[model samples]
Every structure is written in structure tokens, then in C-alpha cells.
Target: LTGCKGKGGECNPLDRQCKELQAESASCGKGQKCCVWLH
Candidate 1:
């Protein structure tokens, strides 16, 4: 769910990039979950 790498492209939730975001969310400080496409 990370931001698209470039214009005209959407982030693929199935990609490894999205996995990084998910991991960050799980490890980030309180109230600081990784902000992905919805940020």
C-alpha cells in the first residue's frame, strides 16, 4: 500500500514494497503506524 513509485501507477498490495509498509506498521512507535496510500 505504499505510494506509487511514479505517476500513472497504482501500488500493488501484493508486492514486496507493500510488505515493508505492513512491517513498519507493526514495528513503528505508538500512534505512528506506517502511512501508506491513505496517508
Candidate 2:
């Protein structure tokens, strides 16, 4: 499956932006992100 939202998938366009956190710890990344402050 290429993404979580598609034919046979379980998501949609507006519901695509999920909080699916990265594995383990050491979260966040370069620049602003949806998982920055949470890290």
C-alpha cells in the first residue's frame, strides 16, 4: 500500500493527517512539523 488513504485503505483526504507517531522515541525533525513540540 502506498498510503493510508486509498482504495482498500482505511483513510481519506481530510482524515489523512493523522497523529501516527514515529516508532520508539527521538521524535520531531527539521523545520516545523506535526510532531515537533511533542518530541
Candidate 3:
């Protein structure tokens, strides 16, 4: 992954982070909010 750099490098991490946050939001108890977790 170190080969990654500049704009494209950040995109990969950001995409992964978005997915991880989605997972956390899913794990949250039903009816709970995820705006903060998402934003």
C-alpha cells in the first residue's frame, strides 16, 4: 500500500474508512442515529 501516494492514495483510505463507519452504523442498536459517526 505504501506505493500509494497523493490523491489516489487518500481515496483508498477514505473509501475504507467510509465502509468501516457504515459497519459501525450497522452494529449500532436499531433506531439509533449515525450522522455523527458518518460525518
Candidate 4:
């Protein structure tokens, strides 16, 4: 996964945890959320 700083370059979706959060979602554990690509 890409670093939170956005400087890790390309990220391999197969080697990390990627998730999508919905309006009533709660799957990313506590204190964390989901991310969407801008492009």
C-alpha cells in the first residue's frame, strides 16, 4: 500500500489492504477509514 504521505509511488493492490467505506461502513477497524483514487 502507498504510504500515508503519498510519496511511496505505485502501490501493489495484491500486497496490501485496500477497502471502500460506505455511509454506514465500519470495516477498517477503529481510528481508520477508506481511500479512493483521484484518477
Candidate 5:
């Protein structure tokens, strides 16, 4: 969650609908990452 942590986002486990955030891969545990929403 380092990337999202500073970008006002969170880390997601599943790659589902992100309403406002963009799901990134390989940032967290197994196929997870820091998610970022558009500003």
C-alpha cells in the first residue's frame, strides 16, 4: 500500500469495480496492489 498510501488510496485484494480508483497489480500480497482514484 505504499503507492496508494501516499496517493490517498488503498490496497485491494480483488480486481473488481473500482468506482473511482484504478486497480494496480503486484504491490501487495499475491495479485494485489495500491489503488488510486482520479483526482
Candidate 6:
């Protein structure tokens, strides 16, 4: 469902901040990564 795509994270290219604090729970497309941010 669409709800699965509404998590507390962003599916974007790997960044320094994302790399520092990230998770794999969120889904992403090719050439991208799941970057979690609560800050």
C-alpha cells in the first residue's frame, strides 16, 4: 500500500549526514539509499 512509502526517512542519494545516521527500513530506488533523519 501507499502507507508503506510514508516513513520517517527519505529515499535519496547517499549523503554525508545520511551516511552518518541512516537506516535500511525505508525503501528506495536504484542508485539511491534510505536516509533517516530525526534531527
lDDT of each: 0.38, 0.26, 0.31, 0.38, 0.50, 0.46
**Residue 36 CA displacement from its true place in model 5, Å:** 0.8
Say what the RMSD of model 1 is.
Answer: 9.6
For 1-39, candidate 4 gives per-residue lDDT tens digits of 323323323333333465434431233444554454543
Top model number, TM-score: 6
Please provide, for model 6 over 1-39, each residue's C-alpha lDDT reduced to its tens digit, 9 standing for 90 to 100. Answer: 121234635566655455422245335644666554553
Per-prediction tally of clashes: 0, 0, 0, 0, 0, 0
Question: Best lDDT goes to which candidate?
Answer: 5
lDDT for model 3 comes to 0.31
Worst 10-residue lDDT window, candidate 2: 30-39
Ranking by TM-score: 6, 5, 4, 1, 3, 2
| Residue 37 lDDT in candidate 1 | 47
Ten residues in sequence with the least summed lDDT for candidate 3: 1-10
Q: Quote the positional error of residue 31 for candidate 2 in Å.
A: 30
lDDT of 3 by residue, 1-39 (tens): 132222322222332333223433433434332332223
Q: Which residue segments of model 6 deviate by more than 4 Å?
A: 1-8, 19-26
Error of 3 at 15 (Å): 21
Off by over 4 Å in 2: 4-7, 13-15, 18-39
Instruction: Predict model 5's lDDT versus the native.
Output: 0.50
TM-score for candidate 2, please give it. 0.17
Off by over 4 Å in 3: 1-20, 29-39
Clashing pairs in 1: none
Q: Write the per-residue lDDT of candidate 1 for residues 1-39, one digit (tens) a residue.
A: 443233323333343443234444434434333434443
Worst 10 residues of 5 by lDDT: 18-27
